[PDB]
Amino acid sequence: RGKKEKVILNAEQVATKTRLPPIRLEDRITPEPPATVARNIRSQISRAVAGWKTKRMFTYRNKYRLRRLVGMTHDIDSDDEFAGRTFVTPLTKLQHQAALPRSPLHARFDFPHTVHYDVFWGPPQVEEEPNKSGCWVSFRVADLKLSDSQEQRLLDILGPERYDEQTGVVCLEADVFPQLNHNAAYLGDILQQLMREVKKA
């Protein structure tokens, strides 16, 4: 273990030396702007087309062709479609079309049901308990007391996973948001929409 040889920089080396240090990981911490993202994507595509290709690329392209043929892609027809930018999102539509009670004395469901949610309590803690934001509603189709067509529509819409045949029970879950109140509101809205769709039967 000895000292590394010292090299006296030449005048040429000092004159042709970078005036700024190279980009570090500490600098990379700053996110890439969308302009750089797009430029990198364009450069990679151009290089790959230019000839830095691979067999995996061909296989991936064939798989994408199969997906497009089965129609599970975002490609646009040249004649059917080619020959809006602002839209109402599905959750906003659900909220807007939802009907809410005027007062706690008014019920907008009219059928038996049970609402379940989980809450966590304990000594002081710095980390929030995971898996405590979902809520669900359970009810019996017989209690709902619908016609045969409406019951079949309900079962088909909810699928076999949400239907327990042993006791004729059906459950609907909502764990789409990390907040229990938001999950409960979404659950109520979707339950109302489900009942409307069942009545459409």
Partner 1 sequence: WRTRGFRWDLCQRGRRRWVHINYPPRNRSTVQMLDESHEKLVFVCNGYIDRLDPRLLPERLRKRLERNRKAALTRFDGKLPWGQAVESAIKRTHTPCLAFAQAHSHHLLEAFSMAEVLEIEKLIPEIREAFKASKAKLAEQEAQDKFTRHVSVDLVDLREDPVSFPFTLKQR
Partner 2 sequence: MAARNPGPVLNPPPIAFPSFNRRCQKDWLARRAFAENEVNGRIYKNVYQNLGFKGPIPILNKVGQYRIRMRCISGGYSRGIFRFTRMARMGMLQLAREGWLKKYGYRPGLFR
Partner 3 sequence: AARRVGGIGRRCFLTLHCSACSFFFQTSDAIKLILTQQHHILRKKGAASKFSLLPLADASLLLKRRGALVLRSLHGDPLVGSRRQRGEFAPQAPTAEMAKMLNKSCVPCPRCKREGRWEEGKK
In the complex, which residues of this chain contact RNA (CB under 7 A)?
1-4, 21-26, 39, 42-43, 45-47, 49-50, 54-56, 58-59, 62-63, 84-88, 90, 93, 97
Is 170:139 a contact under the CB 8 Å cutoff?
yes
Is 135:183 a contact under the CB 8 Å cutoff?
yes
Alpha carbon distance, N-terminus to C-terminus of the chain: 85
> Please, what's the b/e burial string for 78-100 (b: 16 or more CB within 10 A of its CB; e: otherwise)?
eeeeeeeeeeeeeeeeeeeeeee
19 binding partner (options partner 1, partner 3, RNA, none; Cβ < 5 to 8 Å by kind): partner 1
179 binding partner (options RNA, partner 2, partner 3, none; Cβ < 5 to 8 Å by kind): none
We find the least distance from the C-beta atom of residue 59 to partner 3, in angstroms, to be 5
The Cα–Cα gap between 175 and 186 comes to 9
Q: Which of 4, 7, 22, 123 binds partner 1 (CB under 8 A)?
A: 22
- The HSE-up count of residue 43 (CA atoms within 13 Å, CB side) is 6
We find the least distance from the C-beta atom of residue 60 to partner 2, in angstroms, to be 4
We find the least distance from the C-beta atom of residue 101 to RNA, in angstroms, to be 21
Site track 63-102 with partner 2 (rule: CB under 8 A), x = hit: -xx-xx----xx----------------------------
Tell me, rounded to whole angstroms, the distance of Cα 115 from its chain centroid: 25
Q: Which of residues 36-95 bind partner 3 (CB under 8 A)?
A: 59, 62-63, 65-66, 68-72, 75, 77, 79-80
The Cα–Cα gap between 135 and 117 comes to 4
* Residues engaged in binding partner 1 (CB under 8 A): 12, 15-19, 22, 50-52
